[PDB]
């Protein structure tokens, strides 16, 4: 759950993001929204940047309609196999 | 889950919201937001609220970039271990 988390943030990050200097903001932004994801937290309008309801409309640019392909991945990963491997691991 | 909940509850309050006198509030702001938090609601943009992004930028104060780190322990240990817990007593 934490690789697939990677997997998954350090796309996001640099897709997103890319006129970005060396900062411990990196490390952090990474790991931050992805975890977040797992509890509930689909950040719902910070997908597809570029949309009229979105909170960021600066962070439109190129390459970022790719962002909800990924995350459309990543959730399936995080709940529909992985937390209920989990569920399935504790109750066996 | 009722011990986590204010294992948590009273460091972010304390972390947060040092300059308070003593009030019937506190009472409720150690437990009101962590059992919130069992039923799916993250309160995105009030951690880490020395952020941007951020609906509490009065609240950015020393010490107050525990709070994530604090937050995401919480959860780890309400949903990954003790729902899937309460699961499998269930189930079983
Ligand atoms: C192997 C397993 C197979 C998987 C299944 C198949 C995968 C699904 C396939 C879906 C098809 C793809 C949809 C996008 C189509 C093109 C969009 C486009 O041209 O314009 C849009 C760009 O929008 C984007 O670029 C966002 C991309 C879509 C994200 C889809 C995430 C998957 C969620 C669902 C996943 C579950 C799927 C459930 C399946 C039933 C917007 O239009 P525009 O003119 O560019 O802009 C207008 C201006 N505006 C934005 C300000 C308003
Ligand atoms: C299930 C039923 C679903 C329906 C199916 C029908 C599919 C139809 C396919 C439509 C694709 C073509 C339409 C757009 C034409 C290009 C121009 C354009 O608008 O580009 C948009 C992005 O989108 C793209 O550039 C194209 C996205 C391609 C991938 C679409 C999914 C492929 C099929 C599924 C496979 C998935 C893999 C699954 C893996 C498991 C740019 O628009 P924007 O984003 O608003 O940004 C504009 C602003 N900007 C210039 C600042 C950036
Ligand atoms: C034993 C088990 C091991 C656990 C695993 C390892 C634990 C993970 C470790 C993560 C590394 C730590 C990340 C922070 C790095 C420093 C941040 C910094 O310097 O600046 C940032 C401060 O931001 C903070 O101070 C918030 C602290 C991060 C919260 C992380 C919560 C954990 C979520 C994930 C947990 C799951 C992890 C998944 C693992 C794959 C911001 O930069 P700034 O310049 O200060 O400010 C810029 C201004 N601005 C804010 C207005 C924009
Ligand atoms: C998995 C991969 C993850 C990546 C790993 C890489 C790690 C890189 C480590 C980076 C740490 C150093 C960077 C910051 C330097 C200090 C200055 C600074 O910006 O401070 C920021 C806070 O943050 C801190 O003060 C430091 C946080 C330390 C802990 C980081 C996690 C440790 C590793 C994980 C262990 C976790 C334990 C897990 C337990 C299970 C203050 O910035 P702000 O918050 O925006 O507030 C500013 C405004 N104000 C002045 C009003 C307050
Ligand atoms: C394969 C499934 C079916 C899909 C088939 C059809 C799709 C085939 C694949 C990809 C289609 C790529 C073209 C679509 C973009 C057109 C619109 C556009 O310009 O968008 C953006 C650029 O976008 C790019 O520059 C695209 C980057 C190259 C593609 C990289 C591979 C991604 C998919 C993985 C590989 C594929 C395999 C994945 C396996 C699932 C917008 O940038 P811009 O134009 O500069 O906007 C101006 C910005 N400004 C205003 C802020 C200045
Ligand atoms: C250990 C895992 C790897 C991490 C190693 C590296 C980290 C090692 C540990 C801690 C690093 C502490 C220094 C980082 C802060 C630097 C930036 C800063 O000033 O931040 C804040 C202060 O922050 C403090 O004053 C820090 C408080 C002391 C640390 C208490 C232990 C916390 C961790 C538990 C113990 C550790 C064991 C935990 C086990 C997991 C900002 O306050 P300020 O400066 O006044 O801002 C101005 C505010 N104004 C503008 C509103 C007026
Ligand atoms: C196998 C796994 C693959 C992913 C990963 O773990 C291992 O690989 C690690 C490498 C890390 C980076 C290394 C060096 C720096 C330089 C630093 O520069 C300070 C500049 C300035 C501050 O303003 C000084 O004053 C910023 C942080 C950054 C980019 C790290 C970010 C986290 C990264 C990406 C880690 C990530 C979790
Ligand atoms: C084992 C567990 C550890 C945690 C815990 O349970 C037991 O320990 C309890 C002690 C409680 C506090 C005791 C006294 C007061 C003073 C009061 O002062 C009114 C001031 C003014 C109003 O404006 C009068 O007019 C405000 C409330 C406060 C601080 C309690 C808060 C809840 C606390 C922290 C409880 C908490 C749930």
Redesign the interface.
């Known amino acids: 759950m934490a690789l697939v988390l990677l997997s998954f943030g350090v796309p996001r990050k640099a897709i997103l993001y890319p006129h970005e200097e060396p900062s411990w903001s990196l490390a952090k932004d990474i790991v931050?929204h992805p975890?977040?994801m797992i509890?509930?937290?689909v950040?719902a309008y910070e997908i597809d940047v570029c949309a009229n309801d979105s909170?960021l409309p600066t962070i439109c640019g190129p390459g970022t309609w790719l962002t909800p392909f990924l995350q459309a991945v990543y959730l399936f990963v995080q709940y529909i196999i992985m937390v209920n491997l989990?569920?399935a691991f504790?109750?066996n």
């Open positions: 931050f975890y977040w509890f509930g937290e950040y909170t989990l569920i504790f109750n």
